[PDB]
Design a protein around this ligand. Sequence first.
Ligand SMILES: Oc1ccc(/C=C/c2cc(O)cc(O)c2)cc1
Ligand SMILES: Oc1ccc(/C=C/c2cc(O)cc(O)c2)cc1
Lengths: 729, 400, 395
Amino acid sequence: SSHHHHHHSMPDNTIQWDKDADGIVTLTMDDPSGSTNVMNEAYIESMGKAVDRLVAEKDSITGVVVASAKKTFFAGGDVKTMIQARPEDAGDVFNTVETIKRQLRTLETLGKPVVAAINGAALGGGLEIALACHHRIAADVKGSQLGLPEVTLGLLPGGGGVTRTVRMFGIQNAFVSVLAQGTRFKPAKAKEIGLVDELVATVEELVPAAKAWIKEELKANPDGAGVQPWDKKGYKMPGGTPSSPGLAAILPSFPSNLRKQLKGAPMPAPRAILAAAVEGAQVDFDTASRIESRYFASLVTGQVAKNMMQAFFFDLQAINAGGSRPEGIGKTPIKRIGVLGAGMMGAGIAYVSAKAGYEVVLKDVSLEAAAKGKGYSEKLEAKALERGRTTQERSDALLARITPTADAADFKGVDFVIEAVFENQELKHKVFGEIEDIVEPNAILGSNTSTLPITGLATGVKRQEDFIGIHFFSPVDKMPLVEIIKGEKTSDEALARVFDYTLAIGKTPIVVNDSRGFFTSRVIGTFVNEALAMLGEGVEPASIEQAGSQAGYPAPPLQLSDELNLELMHKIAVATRKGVEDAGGTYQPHPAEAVVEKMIELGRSGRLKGAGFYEYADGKRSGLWPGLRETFKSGSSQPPLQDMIDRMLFAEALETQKCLDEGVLTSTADANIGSIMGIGFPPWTGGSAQFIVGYSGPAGTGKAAFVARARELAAAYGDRFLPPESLLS
Amino acid sequence: MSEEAFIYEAIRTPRGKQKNGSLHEVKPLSLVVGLIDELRKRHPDLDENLISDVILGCVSPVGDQGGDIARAAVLASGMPVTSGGVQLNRFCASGLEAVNTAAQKVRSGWDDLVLAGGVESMSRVPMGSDGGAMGLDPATNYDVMFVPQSIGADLIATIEGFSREDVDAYALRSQQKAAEAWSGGYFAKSVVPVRDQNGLLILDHDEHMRPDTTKEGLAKLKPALAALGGFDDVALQKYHWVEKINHVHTGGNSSGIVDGAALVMIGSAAAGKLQGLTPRARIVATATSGADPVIMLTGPTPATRKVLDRAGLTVDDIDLFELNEAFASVVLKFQKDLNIPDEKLNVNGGAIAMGHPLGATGAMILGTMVDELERRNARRALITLCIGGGMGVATIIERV
Amino acid sequence: SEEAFIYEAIRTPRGKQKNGSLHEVKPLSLVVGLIDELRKRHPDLDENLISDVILGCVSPVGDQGGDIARAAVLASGMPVTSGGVQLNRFCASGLEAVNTAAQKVRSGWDDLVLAGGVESMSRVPMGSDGGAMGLDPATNYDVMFVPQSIGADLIATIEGFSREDVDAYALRSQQKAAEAWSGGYFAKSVVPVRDQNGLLILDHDEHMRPDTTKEGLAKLKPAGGFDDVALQKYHWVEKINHVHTGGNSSGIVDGAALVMIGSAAAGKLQGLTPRARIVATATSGADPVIMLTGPTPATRKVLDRAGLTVDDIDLFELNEAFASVVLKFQKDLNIPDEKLNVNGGAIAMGHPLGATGAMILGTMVDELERRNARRALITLCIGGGMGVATIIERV
Ligand SMILES: Oc1ccc(/C=C/c2cc(O)cc(O)c2)cc1
Ligand SMILES: Oc1ccc(/C=C/c2cc(O)cc(O)c2)cc1
């Protein structure tokens, strides 16, 4: 009933009040605790006082304008509080969002027009505040975004975002376009879909245009002023209600289509958003709003939300704030970049380097190949012209900064080298020797390497202080991680220069110490080897792929092994066996190595050869190889699917704990984001390190339950699942 | 577990097709009242006050089939108002569950003479008109892994190894045996032609039958709610060892969408002797079980095996097997698992040729076996129907 | 042959129609919550032995369509062999499910059966499914369709029940229902409804107006030409005295109920204690223009079938659809006043159609054990001229 948190020192005040001579109240949100208005305890009390005052002075008020004094309008909430919400705190969480929506609902049913003056970003609770208004005006300014992206953190729009968007667009359009993926929209895109009604060139026109809309609405439509479409007698939900014959014919396919998109992964947020949407569309607006609160409380008190809030909020903040960057280093921009090699990696590094505004030289062995390296950018620009993302004026500037060549003299005047020819040490030593002198004197000498140690590669150049590993991922235009590998001779200044270069091209960096396999390749190796071991043990290939998909991976493991080429995996096993039998120890071969060699003997080494675990025709996977079941007697071993799923997740999680023990990684933020954005570790886990402390199974939850399940897998599948002493008491 | 239940009458209407059907203009209540009037014509001196209940199966009890269509049948047909009237929905085997419940009510000794059957006018009330939790509850739909019938049948044919030619071979087999049964006059006295309020003929045959069906014409049909994506992925997320689902089922090897109704008069020996009724068959045993709800259609196998064990019989003791022809792969799997002799399985064709009036099919194929046990002078027959959600229902009858 | 026993009988609280606490709760969730309570009381119950789940539902459309009994079996994770069937016999669907479950156990072809009903009238109002008797002019014009409320007013007119007489019974139902709640009679059977987080939604029958007074009942007003239609058959009556209001008629509420019924060997195999024994069941009726008259010939039918009379019954539980129906029933069989609906009825707590039969059935199971009494007769006036009756015996 009350607009406040409690019925029985007090919080701050974040809303300024102003009533003009016309009776228009302008609520200007300006939280003095930070540079962004968030939905915390201070806002709830502030809006509670203001909404009370709107009702008390309702005789002398003709309209309301909700504005902001920050660079953004209103973005997000209090993650430090939501990540602490225990299951026993479901009552407080439920009551908080019910209070938040009780305020907006009174603001919405005031009998007076309410206009939102969106000056900048309106994300999460911010857009929900605007959705409670009757008219939304956005300033078409750079960097502004509007959306409900709480699903990306494992939450749902619990401040009316689910209920109102469904009231505006119907179940199907609100879920698919706005809610299910938390899509962000530029102000121009927002007006097109219906999230925003008007646009203005600058932010100074917002409050004037808002009060102008109030005056015209009061005179033109005096009856329906301050009345939402779903509060009129003859409201008709777009696309129909769940009882409409047209929608009831496609409604049973919505959960199956979502279960198809998620591949059976245990991500509960999209499942809850769909339930709250459909259940909400069956009842009145207030009953729908309360159902929205209960599904929100079930997510915040859950574990997946804490995994995602830890990874995509806290862990991402620490990385982007220079957590792994050396503390006291200055910044030095780079003029031109030199990409050695025009393969799928070299051509990819050329595109992302130019799209950020950097001149690039693309040197290859022959000019015939260097041209088709720049064609990787042409085919991605033509795909951006027909789809209409970039204009013609902008596209010409991108391809112009790429100068494809085969001459080694064009690297004259390059202060950033990114080699990517092939995984061969004597080749890189020769390639770097041909270029280390023509380039600048203080140039960064980076190398896109997957396994060869950077310290060894540095013995082929002169200035090793500026030699470093800069590991990209294919395709470079999509993969957001850059694995910065710190060689033994690399200086702290080189780390920062590559660190800031990673942020300049719009990617997320991690700092990794030199070690065989680094972090991404070494951990993802345990993932594919666990599946190959399962195949050799006689497990159905279709179950192995389904196990990888239902675990949350973006690509099934046997499919990934074909794209990584089994010859390279055999090559790595020979190198690993070489560093053990020479150091004086006996090599313990992984059980997957027997399956790699068998596929090599059968001439099916991967997608490169045209035949692997899958068959290929017309340059596309044509299905699983029929002879695969006969080769390994598939079906003779039928372990439960959860045992297959856990064997992959635990192999990567345990291997990540080893990397944190050996010093390969210096923070769990690098372990989580690096595993998620680098090798595609499932986001619902929050990272390969978060997966340990946030594990949840039938035995229990937490690190103690992770060890118990690891020992359960070790006693039934091999000693490789035994947890290190770092996780034991 | 004392009073024996006996079948005294078992009739049905002809099954009118969905598109341009002859029964589309007939309210489903009229289909039942017509059968009630036929029972009066055959037994004019039957004291209808001894009828204690009328149980009708109906899968879509909405619109013309809402408001307890069994009660509407009792009131509209002028039956004694003390004759009850109840609608039950157990999906596909609602027609046989109504018969089984009537038989069990007689066995308990607390009901004496019961009308049982079903009604389903799918041309007027399409399947799904009643809605359902699975559908309007994405939380339930997402958890139970809901999969339509047609996908579960394709999955059965994929696992068991039934080719597209195998299912079309059975589809032709059903059309041939259904045509031979009509030409032989087998259905002459049990299929009651539907007439209007003036006595003019509306339908006197199962107009869904394509008796000139050929193997070549069945191969040209293309495989068929299920068109909406996701259901293949949802099915293979549970049956993860299966890589691809071979969609072999078309409109020519699947049960036909038709309208129809059926009535079965069930009562004790004392009730039949008091009304001068000759017992036709005896309800030996009934059973109810099921199987996985993502494959759905499988499930008759535990029901058949339990009703055989309950009656102390084996497969060899049964003379006729009547399984609803929802999909060809379901019958082929049922025949393969139990080693059913081909000359004893659906000897007069099935739903592929004559149609599947959901709520009425169970009583239609039951009365079909009562007539065929007499015409052959055979002893026992077993009737079973698959159900969505995996919950089969089986029944054994014995000629008397 | 086999005797059927009642091992458990629970129900949800009945949430009112306007601003109801259960309006946000899907009727499927109401049944699942009761299934989970049965698991809580018998966690080692072999659910594979449960052969069927029979739910009564008068408006099986929307949230209640698609065989809601089957949906409860799947959503609650019960074995898929446990069946699931919806049945509709108007106001008796709750008790018909229990009776059918008992008859399936007696026949020996079912061992352990769940029975009950569910009706979320705030989400699915009655009549949402349509029907022929209403939406078919040919059969409507013939059977003389009259709403059940007018039949109740006609009963009060013929039997001489005044507006004060029906309101006197309404106050009596409110008093006894409030006395039963405060006395803790419903403590074990009424299972509070909670959300997916465990937060409370409803733990009591909120339709009850315990501070009811006879003066307040008199201030109520009595709630298409159906009066002329009814008198065309009951031609000796000149005018119908409309005495029924919202205070002396059954409340429109949401609720669900479950009853576990099985053979003596079934309970002994699963470590269950029989609470009561189903003694006999019966079904009959009378004129459907007055509708709610089936209980009287059905009660005599179940008394003769069990070899009993009125003096052999300790408790009479008739559903309080309308006050005149209970008064008409009380006068006919000369029911002692202290034996009839001793814990209040639907006038106070509500009438969730498809579930009411199982609710008042479990209500008598508790009151027989609380009083250490022997027998009880339960009957509901079915709509459309039918009646069910059941006699239970305490064990
Ligand atoms: O990779 C990422 C994934 C998710 C996010 C979260 C974005 C976000 C921002 C808000 O103002 C509110 C909110 O609820 C969510 C950020 C990065
Ligand atoms: O879109 C939205 C996303 C999240 C929220 C929740 C905010 C919140 C703020 C608190 O101080 C406590 C709490 O438990 C929750 C509101 C809207």
